[PDB]
RNA sequence: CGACUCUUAGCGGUGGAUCACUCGGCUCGUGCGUCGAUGAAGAACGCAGCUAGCUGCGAGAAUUAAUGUGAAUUGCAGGUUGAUCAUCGACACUUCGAACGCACUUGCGGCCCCGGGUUCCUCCCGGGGCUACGCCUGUCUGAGCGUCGCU
RNA sequence: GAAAAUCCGGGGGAGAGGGUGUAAAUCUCGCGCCGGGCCGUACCCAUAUCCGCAGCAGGUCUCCAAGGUGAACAGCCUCUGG
RNA sequence: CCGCCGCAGGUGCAGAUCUUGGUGGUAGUAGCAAAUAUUCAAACGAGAACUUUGAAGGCCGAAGUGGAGAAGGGUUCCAUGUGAACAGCAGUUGAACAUGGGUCAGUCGGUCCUGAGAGAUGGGCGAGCGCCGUUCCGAAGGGACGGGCGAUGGCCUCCGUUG
RNA sequence: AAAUACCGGCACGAGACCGAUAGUCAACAAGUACCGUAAGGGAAAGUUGAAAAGAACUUUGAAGAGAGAGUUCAAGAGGGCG
RNA sequence: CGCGACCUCAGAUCAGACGUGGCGACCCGCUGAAUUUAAGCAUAUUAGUCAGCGGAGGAAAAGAAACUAACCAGGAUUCCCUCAGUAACGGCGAGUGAACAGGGAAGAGCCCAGCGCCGAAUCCCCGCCCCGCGGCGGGGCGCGGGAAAUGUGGCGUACGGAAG
């Protein structure tokens, strides 16, 4: 669900989510666009998970 | 206009993918699989096509249960015992 | 740390689930390392972690079902999981006791007229 | 079409991922026989059923 | 590629062969017992004359007597070292040394059908009892062991040619008068049998 | 002398015969003679660091454990208190399928119990267990101007 | 010259509210708080992404529709776009 | 691998409009002629009648050669790279090939409803897989208002949940 | 019960069988590729060498392709190659 | 009117079980053609065969005489040899076509209901305790429940049986 992704993104990355959009790719895997609440920078938590 | 011109109008399917046999034979209006007859409890197999039988029999697939039964047979179907430890 | 299924079994319930998440986070960080595009030394480790998750989850499940079939040992009704799964037709057979049952009339034949050990001269 | 069922989009997903050429280290294996992928499928030529 | 090719008929590629071979071909042949007997008799009498045994190709020049008959001690042999030593002394060994020379590869498809190595036939050692003689001789190539009571036409006369070299034992040789009889005394070990 | 054409030969092409190979068939024989609501056969979809097919496998996903074996695996990397193989008895085994809450869209519920937001409090969200048909023994519950009984 | 889901109005008046109030039940009024999962969504849509073995003069359901001439959505010429 | 003596057969090809595969002559031939049309300069590049940019001349002419969709396709979309094969000349180009990318909904749809109809159970038939039938020969309702006898949640206050 | 049957299944052993147009349709990624709306139809396709030692380096070409050199008993075996 | 029985028939996500579907070489039950043959053809033949449907098992089915015989008699079933291309069937055409005895492989016999006797002498299920088994079995304990006289168990079955 969007609901399961919201509680997953929260619990694994100690962040809170404004909204989740989802699409299922042509490849077949579900991509989630997890918009974050405005008291958290995405670019400052993207470095913490380790993506650059 | 019975050939080339009439093939253009072919744009709505009679069959779709059956969900027993996976084959594109599940007639949407009749709601029966032309291959396996899905809503019918028993498999649609006929003795007049020996070739059609042997395409879809016990050999064909994995036998993910039935292959280990053959392995479990040759020890008298033993249960709840382990081999003796180190 | 090389995780083997001998120094997991003796350990405690919540002690093993701690180690499970200690591996789960380790794996999720290696799947980020796979996509951020580097470290062949880390892409080999991803399999080692996948199997050590499987080792822990097995020993979790092994010790549950060693404890459940100890719990359900004395009882007359144990769950369908714990009952002996062999072939279906083999479960439908008469018990070790039921095949052994003789009628009173047949026990009397066996007593009066037992098949004798004999041997005839030519 | 644009309007799809989830069941068909999973079928079309698998068929895409099968339509990639063999890796160039598969033919360096000891008992290699495969030269190229024979089960490749172009969208003009072979129409994937349905 | 098959669509519209040619599928039935001897001549068609793929296709069925003309008159497919059945398993109810008459494979086996029965011979009259009297005729089977009068083949063993003939196969035995040919072995007596060195003219016919040499013409079968058996190196028997050094051999002391053609109906070579050895002691009943030979039955009690257990090691091949004992068996090989005996043939050196009887001077039947150049017949085995000739088999060794003949050990070549079979020409044709027989190689891929479990008939790869071919060689020659050696002497045929006939024994009454078995106190180990079969164990002691079997590793030596060319030697076939026969019981006297159970003599085979496929082994005494190999190829259908007559006069194989035979090495009798003493106890074997004396049973032939009983098995086959003389012309005045019928066989005691056959229900109703005279010599032809 | 031309060029062209034809014949023969050498050499070179085209083509894949012939021969020699055979981890495949075919045939006969032997021993066994074992599927499934404890979810079969079959199907779908997934699973490898690099991986399409085949094979293996099931979210523990080219495998876990256990035993036997005792140093490999290998296309390229990479990191003996047991590598790898074999065996296989422990454990696990996604979706559909007899296919089982109802529908085939993966669409709608109902019940009971858990946790979180909450401070059981009706919503919400997640998770868990149940909810198919026939039928048997029993159990419970009521039905009948069926047959009576008693007040 | 459709059905049904769905929604509303009315006729009735079983009930319900509290003893002059810190009013009560009750409000289809105005605000405020919380939530809305699952699946499809790219592109072609045709003198080259569909069907006719093909970039096949065939076939394949629609929507929008400028100026001039003119009865005109005719034909002919032109602008946007191609 | 073969000679000799025997044994055995799926044992001898020019044909069957034979079967399968290969190759000729035809022949560098028919052909690459439906819907008016191209031209100049430059750029990249080993290479340009065809690519790209600019300029000219044209065409579709709003019932379009325009802009969007439904069926159907299934990644053909998009960028970059390549020029083997394919795109019946070519190609620096492509819907080819190789890489990477790309489809974000409470409100657009689907889901919901019923239509023609399809189709279980009851029943009926049928040797049987089953078929007929859709309100018909059926004990086809598991749902709300009140109320006692009871129970717990809150200072059991009194209601939620319920027996 | 036994003696009896058994072209499916799990194992095996064997052959006066077939030898890649043969033998199973299938010796190989074969009930695969591909065809049909569907029931169904259904291929072709074995071989470098003892060992990849699979041709470095130079040279012409934009390149495919060459010329040399080199490996090898042999390329008169150069990756669909006895 | 009420309450207690009984009978007959409903409902349960009631406690515990069980069936379905697959494979289908062999096997059991049905159903069942036409090519073909007869130089045509219709009865016959193909053939109770192919296809169709159902049900199994490691084998199945059969099976301990409502038998064969006509003998000096044999003695369940199944299988092999032979009877035998026979007796018989048949547009008496084409064609079809067994059995007994005989030799062998194997060899094994039995049980009810009824009839009657024994105080239902019988069986099932729940709860406790003790063994105890991945074939829920054994022994205690209970005015614990139930089925069963519309007949459970023992004795007994044509070879006769029972009672004293």
JSON list of N, CA, C and O in Angstrom, two decimals, chain C residues 87-113:
[
{"chain": "C", "resi": 87, "resn": "UNK", "atom": "N", "xyz": [2.37, -40.02, 2.64]},
{"chain": "C", "resi": 87, "resn": "UNK", "atom": "CA", "xyz": [1.35, -39.96, 1.56]},
{"chain": "C", "resi": 87, "resn": "UNK", "atom": "C", "xyz": [-0.03, -39.91, 2.23]},
{"chain": "C", "resi": 87, "resn": "UNK", "atom": "O", "xyz": [-0.13, -40.32, 3.40]},
{"chain": "C", "resi": 88, "resn": "UNK", "atom": "N", "xyz": [-1.02, -39.39, 1.50]},
{"chain": "C", "resi": 88, "resn": "UNK", "atom": "CA", "xyz": [-2.43, -39.22, 1.96]},
{"chain": "C", "resi": 88, "resn": "UNK", "atom": "C", "xyz": [-3.01, -40.60, 2.26]},
{"chain": "C", "resi": 88, "resn": "UNK", "atom": "O", "xyz": [-3.51, -40.79, 3.37]},
{"chain": "C", "resi": 89, "resn": "UNK", "atom": "N", "xyz": [-2.91, -41.53, 1.30]},
{"chain": "C", "resi": 89, "resn": "UNK", "atom": "CA", "xyz": [-3.46, -42.90, 1.37]},
{"chain": "C", "resi": 89, "resn": "UNK", "atom": "C", "xyz": [-2.85, -43.67, 2.55]},
{"chain": "C", "resi": 89, "resn": "UNK", "atom": "O", "xyz": [-3.54, -44.55, 3.10]},
{"chain": "C", "resi": 90, "resn": "UNK", "atom": "N", "xyz": [-1.60, -43.36, 2.92]},
{"chain": "C", "resi": 90, "resn": "UNK", "atom": "CA", "xyz": [-0.86, -44.02, 4.03]},
{"chain": "C", "resi": 90, "resn": "UNK", "atom": "C", "xyz": [-1.42, -43.56, 5.39]},
{"chain": "C", "resi": 90, "resn": "UNK", "atom": "O", "xyz": [-1.39, -44.37, 6.33]},
{"chain": "C", "resi": 91, "resn": "UNK", "atom": "N", "xyz": [-1.91, -42.32, 5.49]},
{"chain": "C", "resi": 91, "resn": "UNK", "atom": "CA", "xyz": [-2.60, -41.79, 6.70]},
{"chain": "C", "resi": 91, "resn": "UNK", "atom": "C", "xyz": [-4.00, -42.41, 6.82]},
{"chain": "C", "resi": 91, "resn": "UNK", "atom": "O", "xyz": [-4.49, -42.52, 7.97]},
{"chain": "C", "resi": 92, "resn": "UNK", "atom": "N", "xyz": [-4.62, -42.79, 5.70]},
{"chain": "C", "resi": 92, "resn": "UNK", "atom": "CA", "xyz": [-6.00, -43.36, 5.63]},
{"chain": "C", "resi": 92, "resn": "UNK", "atom": "C", "xyz": [-6.02, -44.85, 6.02]},
{"chain": "C", "resi": 92, "resn": "UNK", "atom": "O", "xyz": [-7.13, -45.36, 6.26]},
{"chain": "C", "resi": 93, "resn": "UNK", "atom": "N", "xyz": [-4.86, -45.52, 6.06]},
{"chain": "C", "resi": 93, "resn": "UNK", "atom": "CA", "xyz": [-4.75, -46.96, 6.42]},
{"chain": "C", "resi": 93, "resn": "UNK", "atom": "C", "xyz": [-5.21, -47.18, 7.86]},
{"chain": "C", "resi": 93, "resn": "UNK", "atom": "O", "xyz": [-5.20, -46.21, 8.65]},
{"chain": "C", "resi": 94, "resn": "UNK", "atom": "N", "xyz": [-5.53, -48.43, 8.19]},
{"chain": "C", "resi": 94, "resn": "UNK", "atom": "CA", "xyz": [-5.84, -48.89, 9.57]},
{"chain": "C", "resi": 94, "resn": "UNK", "atom": "C", "xyz": [-4.58, -48.71, 10.43]},
{"chain": "C", "resi": 94, "resn": "UNK", "atom": "O", "xyz": [-3.47, -48.91, 9.89]},
{"chain": "C", "resi": 95, "resn": "UNK", "atom": "N", "xyz": [-4.76, -48.37, 11.71]},
{"chain": "C", "resi": 95, "resn": "UNK", "atom": "CA", "xyz": [-3.66, -48.14, 12.69]},
{"chain": "C", "resi": 95, "resn": "UNK", "atom": "C", "xyz": [-2.85, -49.43, 12.88]},
{"chain": "C", "resi": 95, "resn": "UNK", "atom": "O", "xyz": [-3.29, -50.49, 12.40]},
{"chain": "C", "resi": 96, "resn": "UNK", "atom": "N", "xyz": [-1.72, -49.32, 13.57]},
{"chain": "C", "resi": 96, "resn": "UNK", "atom": "CA", "xyz": [-0.85, -50.46, 13.96]},
{"chain": "C", "resi": 96, "resn": "UNK", "atom": "C", "xyz": [-1.64, -51.41, 14.88]},
{"chain": "C", "resi": 96, "resn": "UNK", "atom": "O", "xyz": [-1.32, -52.61, 14.89]},
{"chain": "C", "resi": 97, "resn": "UNK", "atom": "N", "xyz": [-2.64, -50.88, 15.60]},
{"chain": "C", "resi": 97, "resn": "UNK", "atom": "CA", "xyz": [-3.54, -51.62, 16.53]},
{"chain": "C", "resi": 97, "resn": "UNK", "atom": "C", "xyz": [-4.72, -52.25, 15.78]},
{"chain": "C", "resi": 97, "resn": "UNK", "atom": "O", "xyz": [-5.08, -53.38, 16.13]},
{"chain": "C", "resi": 98, "resn": "UNK", "atom": "N", "xyz": [-5.29, -51.55, 14.79]},
{"chain": "C", "resi": 98, "resn": "UNK", "atom": "CA", "xyz": [-6.55, -51.93, 14.10]},
{"chain": "C", "resi": 98, "resn": "UNK", "atom": "C", "xyz": [-6.32, -53.11, 13.14]},
{"chain": "C", "resi": 98, "resn": "UNK", "atom": "O", "xyz": [-7.22, -53.97, 13.05]},
{"chain": "C", "resi": 99, "resn": "UNK", "atom": "N", "xyz": [-5.18, -53.14, 12.44]},
{"chain": "C", "resi": 99, "resn": "UNK", "atom": "CA", "xyz": [-4.74, -54.28, 11.59]},
{"chain": "C", "resi": 99, "resn": "UNK", "atom": "C", "xyz": [-4.52, -55.53, 12.46]},
{"chain": "C", "resi": 99, "resn": "UNK", "atom": "O", "xyz": [-4.74, -56.65, 11.95]},
{"chain": "C", "resi": 100, "resn": "UNK", "atom": "N", "xyz": [-4.09, -55.34, 13.71]},
{"chain": "C", "resi": 100, "resn": "UNK", "atom": "CA", "xyz": [-3.72, -56.41, 14.68]},
{"chain": "C", "resi": 100, "resn": "UNK", "atom": "C", "xyz": [-4.96, -57.06, 15.31]},
{"chain": "C", "resi": 100, "resn": "UNK", "atom": "O", "xyz": [-4.80, -58.14, 15.91]},
{"chain": "C", "resi": 101, "resn": "UNK", "atom": "N", "xyz": [-6.15, -56.44, 15.20]},
{"chain": "C", "resi": 101, "resn": "UNK", "atom": "CA", "xyz": [-7.42, -56.94, 15.81]},
{"chain": "C", "resi": 101, "resn": "UNK", "atom": "C", "xyz": [-7.89, -58.21, 15.09]},
{"chain": "C", "resi": 101, "resn": "UNK", "atom": "O", "xyz": [-7.97, -58.19, 13.84]},
{"chain": "C", "resi": 102, "resn": "UNK", "atom": "N", "xyz": [-8.18, -59.26, 15.86]},
{"chain": "C", "resi": 102, "resn": "UNK", "atom": "CA", "xyz": [-8.82, -60.53, 15.41]},
{"chain": "C", "resi": 102, "resn": "UNK", "atom": "C", "xyz": [-10.17, -60.65, 16.12]},
{"chain": "C", "resi": 102, "resn": "UNK", "atom": "O", "xyz": [-10.29, -60.16, 17.26]},
{"chain": "C", "resi": 103, "resn": "UNK", "atom": "N", "xyz": [-11.15, -61.30, 15.47]},
{"chain": "C", "resi": 103, "resn": "UNK", "atom": "CA", "xyz": [-12.45, -61.68, 16.08]},
{"chain": "C", "resi": 103, "resn": "UNK", "atom": "C", "xyz": [-12.19, -62.75, 17.15]},
{"chain": "C", "resi": 103, "resn": "UNK", "atom": "O", "xyz": [-11.19, -63.48, 17.01]},
{"chain": "C", "resi": 104, "resn": "UNK", "atom": "N", "xyz": [-13.07, -62.85, 18.15]},
{"chain": "C", "resi": 104, "resn": "UNK", "atom": "CA", "xyz": [-13.02, -63.90, 19.20]},
{"chain": "C", "resi": 104, "resn": "UNK", "atom": "C", "xyz": [-13.05, -65.28, 18.54]},
{"chain": "C", "resi": 104, "resn": "UNK", "atom": "O", "xyz": [-12.32, -66.18, 19.02]},
{"chain": "C", "resi": 105, "resn": "UNK", "atom": "N", "xyz": [-13.85, -65.43, 17.48]},
{"chain": "C", "resi": 105, "resn": "UNK", "atom": "CA", "xyz": [-14.05, -66.70, 16.71]},
{"chain": "C", "resi": 105, "resn": "UNK", "atom": "C", "xyz": [-12.73, -67.13, 16.06]},
{"chain": "C", "resi": 105, "resn": "UNK", "atom": "O", "xyz": [-12.49, -68.35, 15.99]},
{"chain": "C", "resi": 106, "resn": "UNK", "atom": "N", "xyz": [-11.91, -66.17, 15.61]},
{"chain": "C", "resi": 106, "resn": "UNK", "atom": "CA", "xyz": [-10.63, -66.43, 14.89]},
{"chain": "C", "resi": 106, "resn": "UNK", "atom": "C", "xyz": [-9.49, -66.68, 15.89]},
{"chain": "C", "resi": 106, "resn": "UNK", "atom": "O", "xyz": [-8.59, -67.46, 15.54]},
{"chain": "C", "resi": 107, "resn": "UNK", "atom": "N", "xyz": [-9.52, -66.05, 17.07]},
{"chain": "C", "resi": 107, "resn": "UNK", "atom": "CA", "xyz": [-8.56, -66.31, 18.18]},
{"chain": "C", "resi": 107, "resn": "UNK", "atom": "C", "xyz": [-8.73, -67.74, 18.70]},
{"chain": "C", "resi": 107, "resn": "UNK", "atom": "O", "xyz": [-7.74, -68.31, 19.19]},
{"chain": "C", "resi": 108, "resn": "UNK", "atom": "N", "xyz": [-9.95, -68.28, 18.61]},
{"chain": "C", "resi": 108, "resn": "UNK", "atom": "CA", "xyz": [-10.29, -69.67, 19.03]},
{"chain": "C", "resi": 108, "resn": "UNK", "atom": "C", "xyz": [-9.72, -70.67, 18.03]},
{"chain": "C", "resi": 108, "resn": "UNK", "atom": "O", "xyz": [-9.22, -71.72, 18.49]},
{"chain": "C", "resi": 109, "resn": "UNK", "atom": "N", "xyz": [-9.78, -70.38, 16.72]},
{"chain": "C", "resi": 109, "resn": "UNK", "atom": "CA", "xyz": [-9.14, -71.20, 15.65]},
{"chain": "C", "resi": 109, "resn": "UNK", "atom": "C", "xyz": [-7.63, -71.27, 15.89]},
{"chain": "C", "resi": 109, "resn": "UNK", "atom": "O", "xyz": [-7.08, -72.39, 15.90]},
{"chain": "C", "resi": 110, "resn": "UNK", "atom": "N", "xyz": [-7.00, -70.11, 16.07]},
{"chain": "C", "resi": 110, "resn": "UNK", "atom": "CA", "xyz": [-5.53, -69.95, 16.31]},
{"chain": "C", "resi": 110, "resn": "UNK", "atom": "C", "xyz": [-5.09, -70.77, 17.53]},
{"chain": "C", "resi": 110, "resn": "UNK", "atom": "O", "xyz": [-3.97, -71.30, 17.50]},
{"chain": "C", "resi": 111, "resn": "UNK", "atom": "N", "xyz": [-5.94, -70.87, 18.57]},
{"chain": "C", "resi": 111, "resn": "UNK", "atom": "CA", "xyz": [-5.63, -71.58, 19.84]},
{"chain": "C", "resi": 111, "resn": "UNK", "atom": "C", "xyz": [-5.78, -73.09, 19.64]},
{"chain": "C", "resi": 111, "resn": "UNK", "atom": "O", "xyz": [-4.85, -73.83, 20.04]},
{"chain": "C", "resi": 112, "resn": "UNK", "atom": "N", "xyz": [-6.91, -73.54, 19.09]},
{"chain": "C", "resi": 112, "resn": "UNK", "atom": "CA", "xyz": [-7.25, -74.98, 18.93]},
{"chain": "C", "resi": 112, "resn": "UNK", "atom": "C", "xyz": [-6.37, -75.62, 17.85]},
{"chain": "C", "resi": 112, "resn": "UNK", "atom": "O", "xyz": [-5.81, -76.70, 18.13]},
{"chain": "C", "resi": 113, "resn": "UNK", "atom": "N", "xyz": [-6.25, -74.98, 16.69]},
{"chain": "C", "resi": 113, "resn": "UNK", "atom": "CA", "xyz": [-5.66, -75.56, 15.45]},
{"chain": "C", "resi": 113, "resn": "UNK", "atom": "C", "xyz": [-4.49, -74.70, 14.98]},
{"chain": "C", "resi": 113, "resn": "UNK", "atom": "O", "xyz": [-4.56, -74.10, 13.90]}
]
